[PDB]
C-alpha cells in the first residue's frame, strides 16, 4: 500500500450566458405582475398594515426582491429562481392558510411560470449549461454525496458536537462574531455541498479546518469545545484518508470535465 494522504494532488483553478437568462427571468416576472389580483405580493410586505406578519415569516419574498435578486444576479439557473417562487406560495400558506383564496392565487403565479419553463426548455437547458458547467456532471454529484455522508454520518455523529451543528447565535453570544470573522460549522457545510460548492478536497477541507480553527481562536487551545472540535475534524480526516484513492479519481474527473466544457 502507498502513502495515501488527507490532502489532494488535484488542482484546477481557472454575451455572458447569465444575462440571456437574467433577462428571460425578468421577462418571466413581467407576466406575474401582469395577472388577476397578484398585487398583494408585488412588494415587501407592509410592516405597518399586516402588523404581525414578519414574526410569522422567517424568510420573506416578493416579486420586487425577486426583480432585484435577478439584477444582483443570484439565480444561476431556472431552478434556483423557481424555488423562490415556491417560497411565495409557502409563505402565504402559513399566514393566510393553505386552501385560502390568496394561497390558491399565488399558486398560479407559479403555475404559469413552470408552464412557461416547459415551453422554453430547449434554450434554458442550453443556457444554464454554459453557466455552472459541472451541472449534470456525474462526478460532481458522486463527490458531493460522499462529502454529505462524511458530515451526517461521521462529523455530526461526535459525542458533544451539537454546538457545531448550528451557527453560533449572535443574539446569544454577543462577541463571538467580533472574534470570529469567518464563521463556519456543520449545517453550513451541508448547504454548500447541496449547493455543490466543493469540487476537490482543498475547498471542502478549508471550510472544515475553520471548525477547529475558529474554536481555537475563540475558546482557546486547551478549552473543552476545541477538543470536541479536535474530534470532529479528525473523524473527517480519517475518512478522507480512507477514501483518498477513490476521491482522487473523482477530483480529477471533476477537473477534466470542467477543463473540457471550457475550450469546447
Amino acid at each position: 500500500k502507498k502513502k495515501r494522504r488527507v490532502g489532494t494532488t488535484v488542482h484546477c483553478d481557472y454575451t455572458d450566458p447569465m444575462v440571456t437568462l437574467s433577462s428571460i427571468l425578468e421577462s418571466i416576472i413581467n407576466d406575474m405582475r401582469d395577472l388577476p389580483n397578484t398585487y398583494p405580493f408585488h412588494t415587501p410586505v407592509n410592516a405597518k398594515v399586516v402588523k404581525d406578519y414578519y414574526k410569522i415569516i422567517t424568510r420573506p419574498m416578493d416579486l420586487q426582491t425577486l426583480r432585484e435578486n435577478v439584477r444582483k444576479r443570484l439565480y444561476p439557473s431556472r431552478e434556483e429562481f423557481r424555488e423562490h417562487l415556491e417560497l411565495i406560495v409557502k409563505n402565504s400558506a402559513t399566514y393566510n392558510g393553505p386552501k385560502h383564496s390568496l394561497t390558491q392565487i399565488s399558486q398560479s403565479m407559479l403555475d404559469l411560470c413552470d408552464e412557461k419553463l416547459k415551453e422554453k426548455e430547449d434554450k434554458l437547458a442550453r443556457l444554464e449549461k454554459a453557466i455552472n458547467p459541472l451541472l449534470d456532471d456525474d462526478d460532481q454529484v458522486a463527490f458531493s454525496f460522499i462529502l454529505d455522508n462524511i458530515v451526517t454520518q461521521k462529523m455530526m455523529a461526535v459525542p458533544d458536537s451539537w454546538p457545531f451543528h448550528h451557527p453560533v447565535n449572535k443574539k446569544f453570544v454577543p462577541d463571538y462574531y467580533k472574534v470570529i470573522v469567518n464563521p463556519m460549522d456543520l449545517e453550513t457545510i451541508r448547504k454548500n455541498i447541496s449547493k455543490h460548492k466543493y469540487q476537490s478536497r482543498e475547498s471542502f477541507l478549508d471550510d472544515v479546518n475553520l471548525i477547529l480553527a475558529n474554536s481555537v481562536k475563540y475558546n482557546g487551545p486547551e478549552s473543552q469545545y476545541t477538543k470536541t472540535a479536535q474530534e470532529i475534524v479528525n473523524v473527517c480526516y480519517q475518512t478522507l484518508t480512507e477514501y483518498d484513492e477513490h476521491l482522487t479519481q473523482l477530483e480529477k474527473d471533476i477537473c477534466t470535465a470542467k477543463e473540457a466544457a471550457l475550450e469546447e
Partner: protein, 153 residues
C-alpha cells in the same frame, strides 16, 4: 464584574399541541462557584396588550452550583386557557425565560409564539370560542430575542 452567562437556549418539542408543557434546554456558565442564588422563571405573556394577563408558569431556584459550565432542561406546564382571553388566543404571543441573581433580573429571553389551528378545515373559519384542544403552538425557535441587563452582583 458580570458573574453568570447564558450561553444558549434550545426550544424543545416544537411545534406541538397547545397544551403540552413548554420545554427549554437552557445553557449557562458561571465564573466562581456559587451560593444558593439563581432564579429561573418562564412567563407566558399571552396578551400582547396588558400585563395583568400573563402567568408565570414555573419557578426554579438554581444554586448552590460550582464554577464552570452547566446545561439543564426547564420543564414548565402550559398557560392556563381560562386566564387567556378569546380574540387574544389564535395568533402570536410571547414566552419569557428570565433569570434572576439575588433579587436581580439580569437576563430576559423572549420568544414570539404562534398559536394556530393545525387542522385543515378549522383554520379557515376559526370558531367564536377558542378550542385550544385543536390549537397548535409553533414557537419561532429560529428567531429568539434577547435582552441582557446590567446588574450589581
Amino acid at each position: 464584574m458580570a458573574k453568570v452567562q447564558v450561553n444558549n437556549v434550545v426550544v424543545l418539542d416544537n411545534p406541538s399541541p397547545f397544551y403540552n408543557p413548554f420545554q427549554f434546554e437552557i445553557t449557562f456558565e458561571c465564573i466562581e462557584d456559587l451560593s444558593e442564588d439563581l432564579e429561573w422563571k418562564i412567563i407566558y405573556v399571552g396578551s400582547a396588550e396588558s400585563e395583568e394577563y400573563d402567568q408565570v408558569l414555573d419557578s426554579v431556584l438554581v444554586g448552590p452550583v460550582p464554577a464552570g459550565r452547566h446545561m439543564f432542561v426547564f420543564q414548565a406546564d402550559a398557560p392556563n386557557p381560562g386566564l387567556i382571553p378569546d380574540a387574544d388566543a389564535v395568533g402570536v404571543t410571547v414566552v419569557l425565560i428570565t433569570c434572576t441573581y439575588r433579587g436581580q433580573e439580569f437576563i430576559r429571553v423572549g420568544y414570539y409564539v404562534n398559536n394556530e389551528y393545525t387542522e385543515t378545515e378549522l383554520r379557515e373559519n376559526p370558531p367564536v370560542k377558542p378550542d385550544f384542544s385543536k390549537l397548535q403552538r409553533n414557537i419561532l425557535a429560529s428567531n429568539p430575542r434577547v435582552t441582557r441587563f446590567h446588574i450589581n452582583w
